[PDB]
Amino acid sequence: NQNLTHLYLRGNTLGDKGIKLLCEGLLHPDCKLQVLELDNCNLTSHCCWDLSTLLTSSQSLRKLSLGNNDLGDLGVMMFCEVLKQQSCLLQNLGLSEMYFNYETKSALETLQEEKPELTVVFEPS
Amino acid sequence: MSCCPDPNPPIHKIVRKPSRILFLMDGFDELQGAFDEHIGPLCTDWQKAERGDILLSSLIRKKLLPEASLLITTRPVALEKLQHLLDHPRHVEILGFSEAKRKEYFFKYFSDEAQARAAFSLIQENEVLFTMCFIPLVCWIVCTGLKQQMESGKSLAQTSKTTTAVYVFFLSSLLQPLCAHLWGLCSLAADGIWNQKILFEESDLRNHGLQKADVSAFLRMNLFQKEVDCEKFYSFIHMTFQEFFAAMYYLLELPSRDVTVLLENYGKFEKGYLIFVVRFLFGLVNQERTSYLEKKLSCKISQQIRLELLKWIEVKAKAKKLQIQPSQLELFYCLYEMQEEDFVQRAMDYFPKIEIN
């Protein structure tokens, strides 16, 4: 369905397996989804690989609102590193309601300054 | 410090989130050093470095990491200095073993019924020890003493009538086989009580005449412990023993060796209240003594100390205050240990009114 531009799944306990399966769909060349919202979805560290893949693979995705889930302190560092290679994501990257360490916050702040095309990342503070 | 081996754990993560965290402040009464319940700053902001008394007080008062849960264990005597910082606590009292549980302990401790039954009968026949075995520490000491008697196969007799007798008995069967270094160990304990130290460095042991060779003897013959949990801090296997040794120190033959001064500082947190130090001092100061370490105790000093102890009882028994050092029954415990009618009756004549619970 090429007309579907916004999908909100926050609150569903999709799990890591859930994200994996959704990504297979999202990585399809005809997918036009622009906004994917994933707040608490019972996520863990594993899904970061698939989310990272999503961030750099999809040419359609513009906003990925990962919210109150244990994304992982290292998982987000992968996002920081990959979202430098001409990513098409411009909007909210989520990562709200999530505790990060000093180095992580610094990396996210650095990303925000170096890539202004990314409106706002939205850390906890 | 109390976390996994990683020196830099996620302190700034969920570890900062209260209500999901419970602290276990084990041994409030063992906080060596003066503890002021009234302080200037209340050390808010956990990341700020401050003195240990303030840090603990701030946690206790729920100003540091508020909404977090806190469990405290303590000797009831130390409630005097703790109740001022609780506001709305739930107080739980720990009671010792019932007759049924005393029995289970013996059978679990000993390798089989062949010895557990003998141990149980040997103790049960002794009304006093059986009653004293209310306390896990006492039944442990008695069982350990029996285990040592079993190894030698001497008799397994258990005829002790007092707390002191149990502790003296324990050392007799442990050190007699050491005797030449007992003074050093006693000195160490006394120094620790007066200098607010439970955990000793090897340097402190050496400075009291105990260097490696004898120290190991105490580690083997379960009397003294090393703390090898990624540390090198030596201590007595239980605070009651440290107080016991300090008590003997005053009666042998370097804080002072002045019992009057010791007694003057009894009702104080700073010295750990010296409850067992005195309770044992009373039991040790007797004429009805025998051999095996006991004969190395100074008879001349005991006679000099006995007099001051009697004066101490008269002075304290006279008090009619509550939440005060020896509150009647405590003096009775002291007199119970000193099982000599001449002394006890003279001491008891200073109690025209007895109020006990």
UniProtKB/Swiss-Prot annotation, chain A:
Induction data: By activators of Toll-like receptors, such as lipoteichoic acid (LTA) (TLR2), polyinosine-polycytidylic acid (poly(I:C), a synthetic analog of dsRNA) (TLR3) and bacterial lipopolysaccharides (LPS) (TLR4), and by TNF. Up-regulated in osteoblasts after exposure to invasive, but not invasion-defective, strains of Salmonella typhimurium (at protein level). In macrophages, up-regulated by endocannabinoid anandamide/AEA.
Cross-link (Glycyl lysine isopeptide (Lys-Gly) (interchain with G-Cter in ubiquitin)): K17, K63
Subcellular location: Cytoplasm, Cytosol; Inflammasome; Cytoplasm, Cytoskeleton, Microtubule organizing center; Golgi apparatus membrane
UniProt tissue specificity: Predominantly expressed in macrophages. Also expressed in dendritic cells, B- and T-cells (at protein level). Expressed in LPS-treated granulocytes, but not in resting cells (at protein level). Expression in monocytes is very weak (at protein level). Expressed in stratified non-keratinizing squamous epithelium, including oral, esophageal and ectocervical mucosa and in the Hassall's corpuscles in the thymus. Also, detected in the stratified epithelium covering the bladder and ureter (transitional mucosa) (at protein level). Expressed in lung epithelial cells (at protein level).
Modified residues (Phosphoserine): S65, S125
Motif, KFERQ-like motif 4: chain positions: 81-85
Reported effect, C48A: Decreased palmitoylation and activation of the NLRP3 inflammasome
LRR repeats: 3-23, 32-53, 60-81
Lipid moiety-binding region (S-palmitoyl cysteine): C48
Result of changing Q85A: Decreased interaction with HSPA8/HSC70 and NLRP3 degradation by the chaperone-mediated autophagy pathway
Changes after translation: Ubiquitinated; undergoes both 'Lys-48'- and 'Lys-63'-linked polyubiquitination. Ubiquitination does not lead to degradation, but inhibits inflammasome activation. Deubiquitination is catalyzed by BRCC3 and associated with NLRP3 activation and inflammasome assembly. This process can be induced by the activation of Toll-like receptors (by LPS), through a non-transcriptional pathway dependent on the mitochondrial production of reactive oxygen species, and by ATP. Ubiquitinated by TRIM31 via 'Lys-48'-linked ubiquitination, leading to its degradation by the proteasome.
Recorded family membership: Belongs to the NLRP family.
Domain notes: The pyrin domain (also called DAPIN domain or PYD) is involved in PYCARD/ASC-binding. The FISNA domain is a critical mediator of NLRP3 conformational during NLRP3 activation. It becomes ordered in its key regions during activation to stabilize the active NACHT conformation and mediate most interactions in the NLRP3 disk.
Record's protein name: NACHT, LRR and PYD domains-containing protein 3
Whole-protein coverage range: 911 to 1035 of 1036
Swiss-Prot record, chain B:
Post-translational modification: Phosphorylation at Ser-19 by PKD/PRKD1 promotes NLRP3 inflammasome assembly.
Position(s), cross-link Glycyl lysine isopeptide (Lys-Gly) (interchain with G-Cter in ubiquitin): K48, K154
Residue ranges of domain NACHT in the record: 1-252
Modified-residue entries (Phosphoserine), positions: S19, S58
Effect ascribed to mutating L31P: In FCAS1 and MWS
Impact upon substituting K154R: Complete loss of PYCARD/ASC filament nucleation
Induction / repression: By activators of Toll-like receptors, such as lipoteichoic acid (LTA) (TLR2), polyinosine-polycytidylic acid (poly(I:C), a synthetic analog of dsRNA) (TLR3) and bacterial lipopolysaccharides (LPS) (TLR4), and by TNF. Up-regulated in osteoblasts after exposure to invasive, but not invasion-defective, strains of Salmonella typhimurium (at protein level). In macrophages, up-regulated by endocannabinoid anandamide/AEA. (Microbial infection) In COVID-19 patient derived macrophages, expression is induced by SARS-CoV-2 spike protein, probably via TLR2 (at protein level).
Consequence of changing K48R: Complete loss of PYCARD/ASC filament nucleation
Tissue expr: Predominantly expressed in macrophages. Also expressed in dendritic cells, B- and T-cells (at protein level). Expressed in LPS-treated granulocytes, but not in resting cells (at protein level). Expression in monocytes is very weak (at protein level). Expressed in stratified non-keratinizing squamous epithelium, including oral, esophageal and ectocervical mucosa and in the Hassall's corpuscles in the thymus. Also, detected in the stratified epithelium covering the bladder and ureter (transitional mucosa) (at protein level). Expressed in lung epithelial cells (at protein level).
Effect of T74M: In MWS and CINCA; spontaneous polymerization into inflammasome speck
Segments carrying motif KFERQ-like motif 1: 79-83
Phenotype for Q225A: Impaired ability to activate the NLRP3 inflammasome
Subcellular location: Cytoplasm, Cytosol; Inflammasome; Cytoplasm, Cytoskeleton, Microtubule organizing center; Golgi apparatus membrane
Purpose of the protein: Sensor component of the NLRP3 inflammasome, which mediates inflammasome activation in response to defects in membrane integrity, leading to secretion of inflammatory cytokines IL1B and IL18 and pyroptosis. In response to pathogens and other damage-associated signals that affect the integrity of membranes, initiates the formation of the inflammasome polymeric complex composed of NLRP3, CASP1 and PYCARD/ASC.
Disorder named in the UniProt entry: Familial cold autoinflammatory syndrome 1: A rare autosomal dominant systemic inflammatory disease characterized by recurrent episodes of maculopapular rash associated with arthralgias, myalgias, fever and chills, swelling of the extremities, and conjunctivitis after generalized exposure to cold. Rarely, some patients may also develop late-onset renal amyloidosis.
Family that this chain belongs to: Belongs to the NLRP family.
Protein name as annotated: NACHT, LRR and PYD domains-containing protein 3
